[PDB]
């Protein structure tokens, strides 16, 4: 129902071009793991959009929480320092866990994992969560003389589509889990990880379901009235790596993907 | 703080490296407009992080709303087509409005504008909003035989910091307006734009404050109890370009930045 006098001429022409592209339909092809970036082809502009379908991809999203009083303009520039200590550490930790794909969005970082990296994704997320709780929050509190800033985290797992868009070219991701992992992180309290029920249902080991004894780690949370999610239930983890047993637990959990 | 038995050895070493970087402090320098990407220098890794301070930068964030039933796996693959029709049109429209910087995050797109592009940012946002209402929503409803999918939108304006991080290199943005524009969009209803009070307070012309008569366009909304924003009030726009007067209004609004 678009009319010429409703839009700029250029906008009108662009919208009609996008309508034509949309009317071409799509094609897809299955690829079991996140492909190398150069294996994602740039298409000729006349073709129907082609997507690669990655099954049961895991998306972790971590975001700074409680930072509204941190500043980029006042003398201490504390938001700049906090951004580095939070985001750069997130990136380096996810890289150390051999994350297939990392990207930065606002005050947050998302990390994509393959469907056979369930436990690796969790171990990387809990490592970052523990860093934030034990290091980031105390140091920012020291610098600000009292402000408590931390993180909150979400994980979802679902099939996604990927292709490249030129703005160079970047991967673009269509589907549920990146959007849903970010929405879960936004819903989470400070120092809380929320995961979807479909991701939680893939966690089977007592190394991740029960504490070290220093109890059930995960609590269900109904998310239906949020009107944001295509699943009924999330699961909440508020604990972190044990100061005594955390390394041993992380070692075992990482190995759980190899079986 | 950190204990060695709480983390993997590699994670421990990485955290200590990030603490050292954080303890170097930061330096900043003012640049009045969003710089060219090659003017944002890559630093040697030993230096305190340097940031460019861009005053009163405008961030628009547009996001798909109501898409939980769209699928990337069922036969119609409707989420793939919808992603193209929504996101690619957003990209092309923002490029047509000469947006200095565009980036894609999940089901959404953000566009950054200079402080002297107040009205251009609004005109680009309302153009995309009108496209979504008049074109995207009807076509997706037709394809799905009834599902109503649309968009929601946020705008904030505040000083930001920018530098480059290598994961070639990408700009990273620290500060309020990208995070806050995304949170405003998440808070917005379908076919609703929410803007911060500080952005709204820069809107002075009746071309943006009053309708063509086919009334006040903006309604205040208190956002204090959201505990997410560093401002008290947002402003809601639910209208779109008039089917008769929309081109004329958009043209005049664009001209408002040149005075
Ligand atoms: Cl600030
Ligand atoms: Cl889906
Ligand atoms: Zn223990
Ligand atoms: Zn009118």
Residue numbers in the entry:
A (entry chain A), B (entry chain B): 0 to 166, 177 to 223, 233 to 277
Task: Give the text the authors published on this PDB structure.
3’,5’-cyclic uridine monophosphate (cUMP) and 3’,5’-cyclic cytidine monophosphate (cCMP) have been established as bacterial second messengers in the phage defense system, named pyrimidine cyclase system for anti-phage resistance (Pycsar). Upon phage infections, produced cyclic mono-pyrimidines activates their receptors PycTM, which disrupts membrane integrity by forming transmembrane-spanning pore, or PycTIR, which deplete NAD+, leading to growth arrests and cell deaths, thus protecting the uninfected bacterial populations, a strategy called “abortive infection”. In this study, we aimed to structurally, and functionally characterize both cUMP- and cCMP-synthesizing PycC and cUMP receptor PycTIR.
(AnPycC) was chosen for structural and functional characterization. The crystal structure of AnPycC was subsequently determined to 1.8-Å resolution. AnPycC forms a tight, head-to-tail homodimer with catalytic centers located at the dimerization interface, with a buried surface area of approximately 3,700 Å2. Importantly, in contrast to previously identified residues, Y50, D94, and R97, of clade B BcPycC for pyrimidine base selection, it is found that F60, K104, and F109 are located at the nucleotide-binding pocket of active AnPycC and are highly conserved among clade D PycC cyclases.
